[PDB]
């Protein structure tokens, strides 16, 4: 699903992230330089709006690489 990438990637990307420019396939958040904590949970807002499907408690906070994130969420309206 291209749809959640673009709109999610786009989202944190231009959220004062990082740059998709630096993200590599198995780059790490917070970790290899994650976002906020209030921007997570705000972000988690918005891809939630357009996923039908919240992705805050531990189910976020179980989450650290960003490609796992919009892996599971991707598949999610993908098919669920």
């Known amino acids: ?3 959640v990438l673009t709109r ?9 992230k ?3 420019s630096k993200v590599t396939p198995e780059s790490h958040f917070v970790k290899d330089l994650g976002l ?10 918005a891809i939630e709006q357009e996923f039908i499907l919240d992705i805050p408690d531990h189910d976020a906070e179980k989450i ?14 993908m098919a669920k």
């Open 1 to 3: 699903m291209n749809d």
């Open 8 to 16: 999610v990637l786009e989202v944190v990307k231009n959220f004062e």
């Open 18 to 20: 990082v740059d998709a």
């Open 36 to 45: 906020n904590s209030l921007d997570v949970v705000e972000v988690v807002f």
């Open 64 to 77: 650290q690489s960003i490609p796992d994130a919009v892996e599971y969420i991707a598949q999610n309206p």
